[PDB]
Structures are given as C-alpha cells and as structure tokens.
Design an enzyme around this catalytic site. Structure first.
Site, short mmCIF file in Angstrom:
data_model
loop_
_atom_site.label_atom_id
_atom_site.label_comp_id
_atom_site.label_asym_id
_atom_site.label_seq_id
_atom_site.Cartn_x
_atom_site.Cartn_y
_atom_site.Cartn_z
N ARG A 142 1.30 -1.29 -0.39
CA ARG A 142 0.22 -0.02 0.19
C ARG A 142 0.74 1.13 -0.30
O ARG A 142 0.46 2.58 -0.10
CB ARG A 142 -0.90 -0.32 1.10
CG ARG A 142 0.23 0.07 2.40
CD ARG A 142 -1.47 -0.30 3.46
NE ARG A 142 -0.40 0.02 4.90
CZ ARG A 142 0.00 -1.25 5.36
NH1 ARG A 142 -0.48 -1.89 5.26
NH2 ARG A 142 0.88 -0.58 6.29
N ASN A 143 2.01 1.03 0.54
CA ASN A 143 3.05 2.53 0.18
C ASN A 143 4.43 2.06 -0.68
O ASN A 143 5.10 3.00 -0.50
CB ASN A 143 3.92 2.38 2.15
CG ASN A 143 2.82 2.80 2.83
OD1 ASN A 143 1.52 3.61 3.16
ND2 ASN A 143 3.13 2.37 4.21
C1 LIG Z 1 -4.10 8.90 -9.69
O1 LIG Z 1 -3.42 9.45 -8.52
C2 LIG Z 1 -2.98 8.90 -7.12
C3 LIG Z 1 -4.79 8.05 -7.09
C4 LIG Z 1 -5.10 6.70 -6.28
N1 LIG Z 1 -6.60 6.37 -6.75
C5 LIG Z 1 -7.27 6.12 -7.48
C6 LIG Z 1 -6.59 4.62 -7.79
C7 LIG Z 1 -7.03 3.58 -6.56
N2 LIG Z 1 -8.22 2.48 -6.69
C8 LIG Z 1 -8.78 1.67 -6.36
C9 LIG Z 1 -9.81 1.77 -6.52
N3 LIG Z 1 -10.69 1.96 -8.00
C10 LIG Z 1 -11.78 0.48 -7.89
C11 LIG Z 1 -9.84 1.69 -8.91
C12 LIG Z 1 -8.48 2.34 -8.29
C13 LIG Z 1 -7.86 4.55 -5.47
C14 LIG Z 1 -6.59 5.57 -5.02
C15 LIG Z 1 -4.69 7.17 -5.74
C16 LIG Z 1 -3.26 7.20 -5.54
C17 LIG Z 1 -2.67 8.05 -6.26
N4 LIG Z 1 -0.85 8.63 -6.71
C18 LIG Z 1 -0.75 8.99 -4.91
N5 LIG Z 1 0.37 9.80 -4.94
C19 LIG Z 1 1.21 10.61 -4.16
C20 LIG Z 1 0.35 10.74 -3.31
CL1 LIG Z 1 1.96 10.33 -2.09
C21 LIG Z 1 -0.15 9.62 -2.89
N6 LIG Z 1 -1.00 10.03 -2.00
C22 LIG Z 1 -2.42 8.67 -1.52
C23 LIG Z 1 -3.12 9.06 -1.98
C24 LIG Z 1 -4.31 8.44 -1.42
C25 LIG Z 1 -3.96 7.50 -0.36
C26 LIG Z 1 -3.24 7.03 0.24
C27 LIG Z 1 -2.12 7.58 0.20
P1 LIG Z 1 -0.58 7.65 0.85
C28 LIG Z 1 0.55 5.85 0.72
C29 LIG Z 1 -0.76 7.62 2.99
O2 LIG Z 1 0.18 9.13 0.74
N7 LIG Z 1 -1.20 9.11 -3.70
#
Ligand SMILES: COc1cc(N2CCC(N3CCN(C)CC3)CC2)ccc1Nc1ncc(Cl)c(Nc2ccccc2P(C)(C)=O)n1
Length: 321
Positions: A142-143
């Site tokens: 997850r990280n």
């Molecule tokens: C487009 O960019 C993102 C989208 C998602 N989404 C989209 C897909 C995903 N889904 C899941 C289910 N779905 C069906 C289909 C895909 C759901 C989350 C999550 C993360 C990033 N990028 C990103 N960059 C830098 C940081 Cl720094 C960060 N940080 C971050 C972002 C979100 C949560 C946690 C963190 P953390 C670990 C604590 O830094 N996150």
C-alpha cells in the site's frame, strides 16, 4: 549519522496550486490530487497534497524533514510544504495509485517481468534508505506508488526514524504499527532495524506475488506473534517457484542478521528478472501488456484540465526557488 543535513526546505504559496479531487482519506489524513503552477515558470506540475491542531503540525513537519532529506529515483519526492493552519505536504503525483491496488485491478495482465522488476526497484529504494540510516517501519504494498507500470517509488514516512550515529536500532514507545508486516522482534520488543524492514519487504513481495492478497487473512493481529513464534509463515504463492519463495522465507527468519540485505535482494531479483518465466509461473505470461500513456491527452483526463501543453512531471522540475 553525524554529517550536517543541508537539505533545503521549500515553502510553497497556497495560491500557486489547486486541489482537484480527493485521492483518499483515512488515518493518514486526506490526500488530494492537484496542479502546482509556480508563477513565472511556464510549467504545470501534477502533485499530491497531504493534510493530517498542534500535535498534527509536529508530525507533518517530522515527515517533511525526512522526505526533504531523501533524493532517489525509487523514493518519493517531497516538492515542498505549504504553511496553512494545518501544514500541507506537497508531493509528486503518482498517477497509477498504490502498487497494491494496481496488482489487484490488473491481476490478469501482470507478467513475471513486471513483478520481478518491482521487487528490484523496491529493494533499490530501501537500500538507499539504509544508506541514509533511515528505518522506514511501514514498508508495504500500500505504501509503494506507481508512477508508471515500469517505475515505482516508496511513500509514507510517517513512521520513519533516522538512526542517530552510534545507534543500531530504534526502540519505539507504544504507537499503532501494522502487525502483519512487522518483524517478530518488532512485535515483541518494539525494536526496529534495517533488517526489520527486510521482513516487511518479504511480506510486500508476498503481496505482489499473490496479486494483492491480505496476509494472514482472517487472523486477528492478536494472534500474529503467537503464529510466527511457533514457526508459521505466509504460504508459498501459486505462481512462485521455490527460488522466489526461498527468498521470502529468508526475510522471515528469527535471527535478523540471517535475513538478506537489501543490497543482496537487488542482486538476486535482478538475476531472476533476466529469465522471468523460470522463476514465476503465470498462465498467459508471454501475451500480457500494461498500458502507460505518457501522452498529453492522458493528463487532461487525470487533472480535468483541457490545456496540458506545459505539464511537467516533478522528476523533470528541478528548478530551485
Ligand atoms: C492518480 O493518483 C492516485 C490515485 C489514487 N486512487 C486511484 C486508484 C485507486 N483505485 C482503487 C480502486 N479502484 C477501483 C481503482 C483504483 C484508488 C486510489 C491513489 C493514489 C494516487 N497517487 C498518489 N501520489 C502521491 C501520493 Cl503522496 C499519494 N498518496 C495517497 C493517496 C491516496 C491514498 C493514500 C495515499 P499515501 C500512501 C498515505 O500517501 N498518492
């Protein structure tokens, strides 16, 4: 551990970036997708903005100190901080989300080449953190974030601790730590080393090799230390040859000095990455493909902005303030 840390902490104006959507919320706080436009520069940078109160601002600035001190292609870059009521961490946007979610959604189109290459890159990042005397304490699938299917980086330094000079381990006090990724000595004695990060690396590889299965699924964290103390471990994933499973089991040994070093994990997994089908057995492996559009049309949909002619990824924006 004694050299002066002359990293630059960059302060960003709130006016020069725009929140666009919520990427996720939870215990870590809230993370927004956003566009950073440094005025004067004809540049638009896709960013992620994290918000976590006096106690909150201290923990945020501790993570900012850690992230401002690392510079590695497989560790996530802190672009700067914003001094609002609650401090914001401005980080590089990883447009494909977490590697855990990625392997879950794309499980049918992920080949052995991609799985093994991810293992190399994660180990390259963790080996760099060991060079900086940084114990992550929260390595997990997850990280690990996905910049492109061929490029991943390590995130979330909320639990990270810098080992001072002449300190070989970090002794934690209480706190909430994910039990199912922790080394046994961390569970029992709250001791964290670079070798305890190796244990978490093995669980992370197990997450990837199972295409995102939950470790010890349906077993309370209450019983984890009891299970490992009796010699029980995570099972051999179906796609894994004994070569790959043996590397995981070495990460989960009681003697922390008997576990592999991140250096050696880089070597071993890169060797297997040259003949991937010999070490991971995936049906349809030769006919798999994972798309990574670097087109300017790709960012217009991601950022919900019609004009992305000046988009620049954070890895290409090195201009200081
Ligand atoms: C487009 O960019 C993102 C989208 C998602 N989404 C989209 C897909 C995903 N889904 C899941 C289910 N779905 C069906 C289909 C895909 C759901 C989350 C999550 C993360 C990033 N990028 C990103 N960059 C830098 C940081 Cl720094 C960060 N940080 C971050 C972002 C979100 C949560 C946690 C963190 P953390 C670990 C604590 O830094 N996150």
């Amino acid at each position: 551990g004694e050299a002066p840390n002359q990293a630059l902490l960059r302060i960003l104006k709130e006016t020069e970036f725009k929140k666009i959507k919520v990427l996720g919320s939870g215990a870590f706080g809230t993370v927004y997708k956003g566009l950073w436009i440094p005025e004067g520069e004809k540049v638009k940078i896709p960013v992620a903005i994290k918000e976590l109160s006096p106690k909150a601002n201290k923990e945020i600035l501790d993570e900012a100190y850690v992230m401002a001190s690392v510079d590695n292609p497989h560790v996530c870059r802190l672009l700067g901080i914003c001094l609002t009521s609650t401090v914001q961490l401005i980080m590089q946007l990883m447009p494909f989300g977490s590697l855990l979610d990625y392997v879950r959604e794309h499980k049918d189109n992920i080949g052995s080449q991609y799985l093994l290459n991810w293992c190399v890159q994660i180990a390259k990042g963790m080996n760099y953190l060991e060079d900086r005397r940084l114990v992550h304490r929260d390595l997990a699938a997850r990280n690990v974030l996905v910049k492109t299917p061929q490029h991943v980086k390590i995130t979330d330094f909320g639990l990270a601790k810098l080992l001072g000079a002449a300190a070989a381990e970090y002794h934690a006090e209480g706190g909430k730590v994910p039990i199912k990724w922790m080394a046994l000595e961390s569970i029992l004695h709250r001791i964290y080393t670079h070798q305890s990060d190796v244990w978490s690396y093995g669980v992370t590889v197990w997450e990837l090799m199972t295409f995102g299965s939950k470790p010890y699924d349906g077993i309370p964290a209450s019983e984890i230390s009891s299970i490992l103390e009796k010699g029980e471990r995570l099972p051999q994933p179906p796609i894994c040859t004994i070569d790959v499973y043996m590397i995981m089991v070495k990460c989960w040994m009681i003697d922390a000095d008997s576990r592999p070093k991140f250096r050696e994990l880089i070597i071993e997994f890169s060797k297997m990455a040259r003949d991937p089908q010999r070490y991971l057995v995936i049906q349809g492996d030769e006919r798999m493909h994972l798309p990574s559009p670097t087109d300017s049309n790709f960012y217009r949909a991601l950022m919900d902005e019609e004009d992305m002619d000046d988009v620049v990824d954070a890895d290409e924006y090195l201009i200081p303030q």
